[PDB]
Design a binder for these strands. Structure first.
Ligand SMILES: [Mg+2]
Ligand SMILES: [Zn+2]
Ligand SMILES: [Zn+2]
Lengths: 1358, 73, 50, 49, 99, 156
DNA sequence: ATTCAGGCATGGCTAGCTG
DNA sequence: CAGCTAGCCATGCACATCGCCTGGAAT
RNA sequence: UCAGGCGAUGUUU
């Protein structure tokens, strides 16, 4: 029917073209004869009739007269719908300032006139004056004025001179203004600018102006001359029970406006004094302000009782306007809801449903099949039959449900499992029955939850629900490849007790021909359910070219385990079920099954497991008894000794050897130690407590205590809970956070005196409050993410490129945290991978990676892999297939079209509730601080030096004399795997070429002191060293020995203010000592405020530390929070004290000193030198003068700025940074998330860009634009013979890159409305659909799934 | 008589065009005549179409062929 | 008459209901004992002592 | 409420998560039957016409 | 509780809410996200067009259901038409365009 | 309030304890939490709750030890200069009534009763920053003033 | 029977003080 | 004439449900 | 049949 929506401003001509009539009077209705008032806010001769095709006069009442108006009251006859389309207007005598264009912050009018908003307010509220066409007089044009000044001027120049006040003046101004000359002069000025803030203001202004010109608009239209009224229906007048009517809001508002307008109109006849009409106009302006946005001026007008009545701004804004309430989620017919229960007799592709619900749902289908089989003539008797509920209907309903899937929904839908499908099977009762093995995916216990049904209607819909959402086709959460059909909590106890072993029970020591007769024994009751036995079993294996082959043998197993064997399908090995079968075991069982035998076997195997599990668990009967939580016989004595210890410490305190917090910490530590001892005691007294005879004497074994089983299985609870049932329940914090100083020496089995229970209450209540607030923030995060990645759909097949990124296994210097196999699985090769038999290619460059290829990589010690990412595709508007890898939740590569943005968003959002809120994330320096003073090699290999300048002292150790050196890790091949800096004067435990292993500490120093290492041995004198003048002899209490502290120029004397303290090596006598080999003197000169420890008459070595450089370093990484850390990382906030970096490669120097702060300058090798920047010198400097480095290098420390990282290092670098960071923040809390999704979010984060040189293009220089547009532009530009364009990618926070989008309705449905609608309105911004949320709004298809085929056909149409 | 669609996914490697193909065949069977090509089992057109797909004798190609052959008239 | 789920007890650390169950068992024990002693109608002195 | 004999043991799934199970010996003696009372109102307005 | 075809609200021709008022459920925003997550599209279309908004839509739908022919005809929603009117209430001019 | 002065042996011991906590203790509780999360309920579950509590408690310890290791001034001074009692010294003190005591003076982090267990900020040490063998020294206990006498000193 | 008095976090902006 | 710079506003705050209650004062 | 108040049930450190 149509295409792209368009939006613009409105002219009075446009409005009068819109409306059909004109309002005059404020009345509403009679209250007496409920026919509407004449010519008012409900008038047929304006809006239209009430009853279909019946004039209010009561003359014509039949379609015979369709289309003619009345003559006594003059009303057109038409369907009553029209009162949902026609519209009306109002005549305002005075003009009126619209308000969105006045207080949007920025102010459109405001910067249009280049005028202070305050004074513009003053004008529009009648407390000032302003000039228009001052002429050849003393005054100016924009010159605002006050009362007495106006009076004096009129006294002196009451002539042609003109100034006014009120909206008319704004109107005259704007209508007078031109735009061409404005643009010319402003461009002149911008050529002539030199100040950046001025440039910023002027460039905003010029952008707005040139846009306002390009679009076909006229500024004066920003001032309402004629206001349109909303149609009648949309402001309905509902009657209440009683002779009253439910008052709306828009009615009251319009009525107020019309009263005020009519009063003013009456006032312009008597020519009353002007103060009156001024007060009048002020009232009217404030009223129209109220109607458009009640609540943006001062105190908002109230309504009936106390609250701001709702206005149109609220009709659209907020969590309750139209967008988030009636266009993104609509209530829907054909549905219902009820309570759930279990019903384990179901195969997991079917679910219960109650008769009465069904017979209410499928009423249409029933009607149809009825009149098809010919049992009622019309629909009437049909409905009568289906209400009376006679016989045949139930059979009919069975015939129509048989194969007609349905959808089940639960309330807090987080991830796309939140809606699955099923087939019905009719049940009695009144409560939905639902299979057990899905109550984990729904995250739905049976404590009284509620679920909703939905019934697809059309045929495409049925096929969708079956081929995509039926439960069998979801055995893997798209978050991460682990299964989701994990058997949950009883079935596990079942299988557990079904497979285990004692040492001696009935039937031990016999042989069985087959699992068949095994089960036969166990039923007959002549052999225990578990007793080790030799049996025969036969297994299958597909080792051939996809072909099954059998082999049989005599295994040693347990009878029950044999019974379990009769369910495993043909293809597994046998060792998968020959152990305890906890929870992890059965999980990887199903997993291997799915990886090796397709899908159908796995489904049927899951069902059989659940059945047999419930059966044998029941036959087992694992209760819980109070005499089965054994308190160890040593709790008493341990608490006794603890009390003795705190008594000793209290004695020592009142004897005077400790302080307050000292006693505090001492006590708390010894209690904690006692706690741990108790825990170990109970765990040993339970887990293996069973000791029995074997037909010999005795031998211990794992126990049969019910609680230990219910824990070791993996069903519920663990060491922690069994602790809080047996041992003391540790310590309890208090609201202050100060942990309390007396433990709770009791436990839930014994009693509790009051105080203890009270304190535990403290704890629990604080917990609940945090649950609430954290939920809130999690939801908000999820929403924001899905509104930024919404518009990304896999749209082609092969970008055909050669870029990528590098993946390496993450190692913390020591242990490897996550292996290369896991970080690579599924994502697709970028280049080829040559074996470490170099010049021998192993795998091709453009291949998928499944598990066999994974193992092939593992079997050759693959160092790193270059892989295709998403963040660097080459697609127009889309993201190509190969660059996205295995779509988790399915085996093969992603299909051409499956949207990814949304699933990615939901996955990064879901676990979010598990994060904390207020802690301090310290996963980023645990190893940094632990390895500051000692360099940590990561992998095995020899030690290589780079630009060595060192010497081995007489102590027998190698120390380096310059920063020029670098560390490399030689491999067994000859390349470089690891690289490291070289601290000045480091300690080298190893040497060069000395083949060593990986992870070995070979260096040490003080990370707070640069050494003053010598070159050779000798003795030291006080060469150029004077106390008071140069140095000071400060006494050092807490070390015995004292030292010499350098007195800087700012503190020392003046006569030696410049004398540089020196140190020359000498012999025992003091002869002249030069540099070894060279004629140059050999005294080292001391920097300022240093600490010399040695004195006269001291022997040193070749490179011995003479003095010490006090080196301060602040590691205040306390900014880290956790969930807000995630927030800020997707926000791109600038951290508090950002570390500055190296603009361009070159040498460095200083400049002016103390301009409030210090300066810095850098000169390239051969480039533009004058670069400088102001540094607050109080920050540390990790740099020296003579140091020459490369662009993008670091200079100071602290956080690392994403902005600068982007603009300096590389897109690969920035994306790697964000992924490592956010992954660590999660994985610290232990939640697996494949990295693809974070990658795709980052991509959408950096979608905009800016220009550098116009080239031959068609843009302004200082202009912002989306990357894709300009790339496709300059591509076809270069296609012919012209010059390209220059640009720069720039990173933006999500809450911004949402708004700054081609489409606008997208934004308009997100987080605010006024800003977006106004900017778009002044822009005149056309908008194609081209996305998802749009098409969901307008209701046509979606370019995501099947809609992808549809939209391609549509685009091909033209 | 249908639980999963794996064989269909195999015979047409899209898992989406499956939907459209099946729907088209189903409309043919429900609106206007054109009796099915497999022994039915008192089952609805939907399952019928998926089944005739996995039998491997219906896809977009054959559909357009037979539509053209009708339109021959 | 009612069969709850054992695995619910260690999870929700409310060990109480198990003690409640035991003590109730004792209660109904005394009850049934008295009921027998009364149905086999006896001299009241036995009830007194018991 | 009332006091009933109870026993803790899994029993063929039907008490999977927290689903109590109840035997007909209860629903016979009417020892959870409840009584509810609703209240319905008709009115007599006097509208023109 | 369950509803097939009952009343309809007056401002925005949508089904009502609650039970006492004989209405139907609510198909939440996050659920629309889910359905977009799967490739399912026709389901979403007739989930928020034929069963909620287009008056002509559901009349046609009902008349077709009663005779076997399972087939929708989308048309335009109506709450959106209301959104158009309430923005037009202000100084703005919003429109559809050429076909 | 504090003093960054620490002895090198305890420094090494503390660093090793840090490494122990961060390598072979964190990941096990990590696995337990990742496990427990896969259960359905979270407010009706306590295993996740208390295991998370364990994480919080170990995190606080590692934070404290980290800041310490950042701000530890080390003085591994030898017996080079001896004659007074200033730091890192074994000290015998006796009462004029028979009460005797042997102890070594160390920094704040080295007080767990085993070998050398007295902090400098204690009034005892504060009255002994430098003394001579055979001298009186008094302190101000909350129950009044006290007195003892030195016996012997051996640094190492 | 008509009528007129307990929040937080963040970002954006504007006078207002040093060179 | 420029670079902060502290102080003052705008805008934001999960989803789903059920029951009950009350909707201008003066002339 | 609309808007508010109140209370309650779920998921939710
Ligand atoms: Mg629940
Ligand atoms: Zn008429
Ligand atoms: Zn690509």
């Amino acid at each position: 029917e149509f295409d792209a929506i368009k939006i613009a401003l409105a002219s009075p001509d446009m409005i009068r073209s819109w409306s059909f009539g004109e309002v005059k009077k404020p009345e509403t209705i009679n209250y007496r004869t409920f026919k509407p008032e004449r010519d008012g806010l409900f008038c047929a001769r304006i809006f239209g009739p009430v009853k279909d095709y019946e004039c209010l006069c009561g003359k014509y009442k039949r379609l015979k007269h369709r289309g003619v108006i009345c003559e006594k009251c003059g009303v057109e006859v038409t369907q009553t719908k029209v009162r949902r389309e026609r519209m009306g207007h109002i005549e305002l005598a005075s003009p009126t300032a619209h308000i969105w264009f006045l207080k949007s912050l920025p102010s459109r009018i405001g910067l249009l006139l280049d005028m202070p908003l305050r004074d513009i307010e003053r004008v529009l509220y009648f407390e000032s004056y302003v000039v228009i066409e001052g002429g050849m007089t003393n005054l100016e044009r924009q010159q605002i004025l006050t009362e007495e000044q106006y009076l004096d001027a009129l006294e002196e120049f009451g002539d042609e001179f003109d100034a006014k006040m009120g909206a008319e003046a704004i109107q005259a101004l704007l209508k007078s203004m031109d735009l061409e000359q404005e643009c010319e002069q402003l461009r002149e000025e911008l050529n002539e600018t030199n100040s950046e803030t001025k440039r910023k203001k002027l460039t905003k202004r010029i952008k707005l102006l040139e846009a306002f010109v390009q679009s076909g608009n006229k500024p004066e239209w920003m001032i309402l001359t004629v206001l349109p009224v909303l149609p009648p229906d949309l402001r309905p007048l509902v009657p209440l029970d009683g002779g009253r009517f439910a008052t709306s809001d828009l009615n009251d508002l319009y009525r107020r406006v019309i009263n005020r307008n009519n009063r003013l109109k009456r006032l312009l006849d008597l020519a009353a004094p002007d103060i009156i009409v001024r007060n009048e106009k002020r009232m009217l302006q404030e009223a129209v302000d109220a109607l458009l946005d009640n609540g943006r001026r001062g105190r908002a007008i109230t309504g009936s009782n106390k609250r701001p009545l709702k206005s149109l701004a609220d009709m659209i804004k907020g969590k309750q306007g139209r967008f988030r309430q009636n266009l993104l989620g609509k209530r829907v017919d054909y549905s219902g809801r009820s309570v759930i229960t279990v019903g384990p007799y179901l195969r997991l592709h079917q679910c219960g449903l109650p008769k009465k619900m069904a017979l209410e749902l499928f009423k249409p289908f029933i009607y149809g099949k009825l009149e098809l089989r010919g049992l009622a003539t019309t629909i009437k008797a049909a409905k009568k039959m289906v209400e009376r509920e006679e016989a045949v209907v139930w059979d009919i309903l069975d015939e129509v449900i048989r194969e007609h899937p349905v959808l089940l929904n639960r309330a807090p839908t987080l991830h796309r499992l939140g809606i699955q499908a099923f087939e019905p099977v009719l049940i009695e009762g009144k409560a939905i029955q639902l299979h057990p093995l899905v109550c984990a995916a729904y995250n739905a216990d049976f404590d009284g939850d509620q679920m909703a049904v939905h019934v697809p209607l059309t045929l495409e819909a049925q096929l969708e629900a079956r081929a995509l959402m039926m439960s069998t086709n979801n055995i893997l959460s798209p978050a991460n490849g682990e299964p989701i059909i994990v058997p949950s909590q009883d079935v596990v106890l079942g299988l557990y007790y079904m497979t285990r072993d004692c040492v001696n029970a009935k039937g031990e020591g016999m042989v069985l021909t087959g699992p068949k007769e095994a089960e036969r024994l166990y039923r007959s009751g002549l052999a225990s359910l578990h007793a080790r036995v030799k049996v025969r079993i036969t297994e299958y294996e597909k080792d051939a070219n996809g072909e099954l082959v059998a082999k049989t043998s005599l295994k040693d197993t347990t009878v029950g385990r044999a019974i379990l064997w009769m369910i495993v399908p043909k293809g597994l090995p046998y060792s998968i079920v020959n152990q305890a079968l906890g929870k992890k075991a059965i999980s990887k069982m199903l997993n291997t099954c799915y990886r090796i035998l397709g899908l159908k076997p796995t489904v049927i195997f899951a069902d059989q497991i659940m059945y047999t599990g419930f059966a044998y668990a029941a036959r087992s009967g694992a209760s819980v008894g109070i005499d089965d939580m054994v308190i160890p016989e040593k709790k008493h004595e341990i608490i006794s000794e603890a009390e003795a210890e705190v008594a000793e410490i209290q004695e020592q305190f009142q004897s005077g050897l400790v302080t307050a917090g000292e006693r505090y910490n001492k006590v708390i530590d010894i209690w904690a130690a006692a706690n741990d001892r108790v825990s170990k005691a109970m765990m040993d007294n339970l887990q293996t407590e069973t000791v029995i005879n074997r037909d010999g004497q005795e031998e211990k074994q794992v126990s049969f205590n019910s609680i230990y089983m219910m824990a070791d299985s993996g069903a519920r609870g663990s060491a922690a809970q069994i602790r809080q049932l047996a041992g003391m329940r540790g310590l309890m914090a208090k609201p202050d956070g100060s942990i309390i100083e007396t433990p709770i020496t009791a436990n839930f089995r014994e009693g509790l005196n009051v105080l203890q229970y009270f304190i535990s209450t403290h704890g629990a209540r604080k917990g609940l409050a945090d649950t609430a607030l954290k939920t809130a923030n999690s939801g908000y995060l999820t929403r924001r993410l899905v509104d930024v990645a919404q518009d990304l759909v896999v749209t082609e097949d092969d970008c055909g490129t050669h870029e990528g990124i590098m993946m390496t296994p993450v190692i913390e210097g020591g242990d490897v945290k996550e292996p290369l196999r896991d970080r690579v699985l599924g994502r697709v090769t970028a280049e080829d991978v040559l074996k470490p038999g170099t010049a021998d290619i192993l795998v091709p460059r453009n291949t998928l990676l499944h598990e066999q290829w994974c193992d092939l990589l593992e079997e050759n010690s693959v160092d790193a892999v270059k892989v295709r990412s998403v963040v660097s595709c080459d697609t127009d508007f889309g993201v190509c297939a190969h660059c996205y890898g295995r779509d988790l939740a399915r085996g093969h590569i992603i299909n051409k079209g499956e949207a990814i943005g949304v699933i990615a968003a939901q996955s990064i959002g879901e676990p979010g509730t598990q994060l904390t809120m207020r802690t301090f994330h310290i996963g980023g320096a645990a190893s940094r601080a632990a390895a500051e003073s000692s360099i940590q090699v990561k992998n095995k290999g020899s030690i290589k030096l780079s630009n060595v300048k060192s010497v081995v002292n007489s102590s027998g150790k190698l120390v380096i004399t310059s920063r020029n050196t670098e560390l490399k890790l030689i491999d067994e091949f000859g390349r470089t795997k690891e690289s490291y800096k070289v601290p000045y004067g480091a300690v080298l435990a190893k040497g060069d070429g000395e083949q060593v292993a990986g992870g070995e500490t070979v260096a040490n120093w003080d990370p707070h002191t640069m050494p003053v290492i010598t070159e050779v041995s000798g003795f030291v004198r006080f060469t150029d060293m004077i106390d008071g003048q140069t140095i000071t002899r400060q006494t050092d209490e807490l070390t015995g020995l004292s030292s010499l502290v350098v007195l800087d120029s700012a503190e020392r004397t003046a006569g030696g203010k410049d004398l540089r303290p020196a140190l020359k090596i000498v012999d025992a006598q003091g002869n002249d000592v030069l540099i070894p080999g060279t004629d140059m003197p050999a005294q080292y000169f001391l920097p300022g405020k240093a600490i010399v420890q040695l004195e006269d008459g001291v022997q040193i070595s070749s490179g011995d530390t003479l003095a010490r450089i006090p080196q301060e370093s602040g590691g205040t990484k306390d900014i880290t929070g956790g969930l807000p850390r995630v927030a800020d990382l997707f926000e791109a906030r600038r951290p508090k004290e950002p570390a500055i970096l190296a603009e361009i490669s070159g040498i460095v120097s200083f400049g002016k000193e103390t301009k409030g702060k210090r300066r810095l300058v850098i000169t390239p090798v051969d480039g533009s030198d004058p670069y400088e920047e102001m540094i607050p010198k109080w920050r540390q400097l990790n740099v020296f003068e003579g140091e020459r480095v490369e662009r993008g290098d670091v200079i100071s420390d602290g956080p690392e700025a994403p902005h600068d990282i982007l603009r300096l290092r590389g897109v690969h670098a920035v994306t790697r940074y964000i992924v490592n960071e956010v992954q660590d923040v999660y994985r610290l809390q232990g939640v697996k998330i494949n990295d693809k999704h974070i990658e795709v979010i980052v991509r959408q984060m950096l979608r905009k860009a800016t220009i550098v040189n116009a080239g031959s293009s068609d843009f302004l220089e200082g202009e912002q634009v989306e990357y894709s547009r300009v790339k496709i532009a300059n591509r076809e530009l270069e296609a012919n013979g012209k010059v390209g364009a220059t640009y720069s990618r720039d990173l933006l926070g999500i809450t911004k890159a949402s708004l700054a989008t081609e489409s606008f309705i997208s934004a308009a449905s997100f987080q605010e409305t006024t800003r977006v609608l106004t900017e778009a309105a002044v822009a005149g911004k056309r908008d194609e659909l081209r996305g998802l949320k749009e098409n969901v709004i307008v209701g046509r298809l979606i370019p995501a799934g099947t809609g992808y085929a549809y939209h391609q056909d549509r685009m091909r149409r033209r | 008589a249908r639980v999963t669609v794996q064989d269909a996914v195999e015979k047409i490697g899209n898992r989406f065009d499956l939907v459209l193909v099946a729907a088209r065949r189903a409309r043919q069977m429900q609106v206007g005549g054109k009796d099915p090509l497999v022994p039915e089992e008192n089952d609805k057109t939907t399952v019928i179409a998926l089944r005739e797909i996995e039998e491997g004798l219906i896809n977009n190609q054959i559909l357009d062929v037979r539509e053209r052959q009708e339109q021959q008239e | 008459d009612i069969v709850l789920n054992p695995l619910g007890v260690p999870s929700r650390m409310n060990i109480g209901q198990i003690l409640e169950t035991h003590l109730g068992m004792a209660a109904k024990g005394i009850g049934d004992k008295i009921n027998a002693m009364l149905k086999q109608q006896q001299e009241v002195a036995k009830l007194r002592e018991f | 409420g009332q006091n009933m004999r109870v026993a803790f043991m899994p029993w063929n799934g039907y008490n999977f998560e927290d689903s109590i199970l109840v035997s007909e010996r209860v629903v016979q003696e009417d020892r959870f039957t409840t009584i509810h009372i609703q209240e319905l109102a008709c009115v007599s307005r006097d509208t023109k016409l | 509780h369950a509803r097939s075809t009952g009343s309809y609200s007056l401002v925005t021709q949508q089904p009502l809410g609650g039970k006492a008022q004989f209405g139907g459920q609510r198909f939440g925003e996050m659920e629309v996200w889910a359905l977009e997550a799967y490739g399912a599209a026709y389901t979403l279309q007739e989930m928020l067009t034929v069963k909620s908004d287009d008056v002509n839509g559901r009349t046609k739908m009902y008349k077709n259901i009663v005779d076997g022919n399972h087939q929708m005809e989308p048309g335009m929603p109506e709450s959106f038409n209301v959104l158009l009117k309430e923005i037009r209430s202000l100084g703005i001019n919003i429109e559809l365009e050429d076909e | 309030m504090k003093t960054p002065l620490v002895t090198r042996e305890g420094y090494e011991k503390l660093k090793q304890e840090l490494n122990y906590l961060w390598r072979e203790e964190r990941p096990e509780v990590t696995k337990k939490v990742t496990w427990a999360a896969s259960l359905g309920d979270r407010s009706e579950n306590a295993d996740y709750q208390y295991n998370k509590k364990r994480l919080r408690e170990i995190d606080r310890r590692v934070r404290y030890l980290t800041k310490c290791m950042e701000n530890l001034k080390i003085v591994d001074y030898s017996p080079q200069q001896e004659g007074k009692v200033f730091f890192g010294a074994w000290v015998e003190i006796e009462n004029d009534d028979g009460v005797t005591h042997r102890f070594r003076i160390v920094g704040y982090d080295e007080i767990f009763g085993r070998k050398d267990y007295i902090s400098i900020d204690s009034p005892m040490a504060r009255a002994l920053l430098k003394k001579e063998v055979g001298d009186l020294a008094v302190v101000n206990t909350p129950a009044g003033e006290a007195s003892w006498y030195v016996n012997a000193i051996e640094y190492v």
